Design a protein around this ligand. Sequence first.
Ligand SMILES: [Cl-]
Ligand SMILES: [Cl-]
Lengths: 268, 266
Amino acid sequence: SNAMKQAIGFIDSGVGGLTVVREVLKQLPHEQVYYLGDTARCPYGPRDKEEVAKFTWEMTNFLVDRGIKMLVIACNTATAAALYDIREKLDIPVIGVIQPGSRAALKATRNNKIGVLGTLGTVESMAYPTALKGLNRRVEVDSLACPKFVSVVESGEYKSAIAKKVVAESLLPLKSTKIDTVILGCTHYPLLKPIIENFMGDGVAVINSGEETASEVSALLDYHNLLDATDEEIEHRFFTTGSTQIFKDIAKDWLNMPDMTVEHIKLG
Amino acid sequence: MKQAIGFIDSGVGGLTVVREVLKQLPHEQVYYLGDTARCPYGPRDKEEVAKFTWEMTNFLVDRGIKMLVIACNTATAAALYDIREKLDIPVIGVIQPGSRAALKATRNNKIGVLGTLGTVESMAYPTALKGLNRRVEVDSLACPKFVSVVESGEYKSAIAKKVVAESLLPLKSTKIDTVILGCTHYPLLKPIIENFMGDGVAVINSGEETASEVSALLDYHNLLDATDEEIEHRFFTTGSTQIFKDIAKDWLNMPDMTVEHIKLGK
Ligand SMILES: [Cl-]
Ligand SMILES: [Cl-]
């Protein structure tokens, strides 16, 4: 039976949340994942906060109805828009990805000059400089909106020549700075990390916040006595509001999970 | 209104956790209590360790703390559960964070744990590790000489090199790729341990993950301060303030600190 195992829920606009899933699979191999990507409504990047929060709640309600024991808002715009409201209203633990990436960045920097890549809405929220300066008021933080990146990732062309061109064109400004650490402030961006790293070179630490987010999941599950303790067969479930085949093609590449269950759903 | 993060320990080891808090949480004030007059705790009764740990807890709670770190492996193993249950502030120890850090660092899931005889005999690390990944392999090794090498200031010297080489040779016959420093004194030896173990082994200073978890929990509860203006750290010991200050001002790079002598229990 699967009745004892309760899933950790993850919500995101598309495939980006899988960068957190990957580190959860590694750090918490006994935990079941329920994932929902709102592919039909991706991009969230250029949407208004009120709308993002509304959509984020739709995703949350879908997974809460399926019995999850914890929720990860594996999406930067969604975190900025709705984390506190959702944390406050739910009874289960709820985290986002902005604070973990902030902590990781501060740990990686040598000169306290941090760059942030994200969407239009993430950049406009100022969530990263606010979080970063909240931990260390002396850090310098400069952010760059990369509206093309999610399109390249969602179209599955994140290893292609086009990806290489879009990265080089979007990131050239960073080379005018002394920034030594760059936060991937959209959860889609680690799919491009090899290209970003090759472009920026060995002097810049490129931060995928998935590892730090997954450690926070582990820490909170242990703290609240919520770690799974059963031998029941793990049955992960992926849900998308778009096409299942394209989701599977990307997810199977990123996670190495050949026998994945991916279903289409309708929200809103 | 500004409240400290509290740290309790049997002695000076816990200052290696403080060091990472100073780095990661520069806005936060720390109150640290080392019960050097009754250390080590490791050979004492679990009930007794728990009693002493509660006396330190009560002392800092009276001073105004918003979070407590039991910065001691022995005390974490003996009283964390009870203190967390009874207090209304977040309480953590160093074992779960070091275990998490190891599981992040390992590539082959073969982990070593270095500690005092008490800590290793408690099985606290294997319990924590296997509770996260039941397939992990864990080799525990008590290293009774290390605390002395650290506290005597020999931790960089040929003495430390020899003691480390002698103490850790059994691990060379394993395929471990990750070693937890499961005594808070041991980060002072980390460079020498890394050299002995070589570049294929991740050596974990669990103070780093501990500090991250403090940061995370403060954030979760909306208790992260925004400035280091008017920070006033306090250090307390039941033993010699001078020997403590000598150690602490070095390890924390804090020339001007004040160390207060206190009386606990009896
Ligand atoms: Cl965008
Ligand atoms: Cl803990």
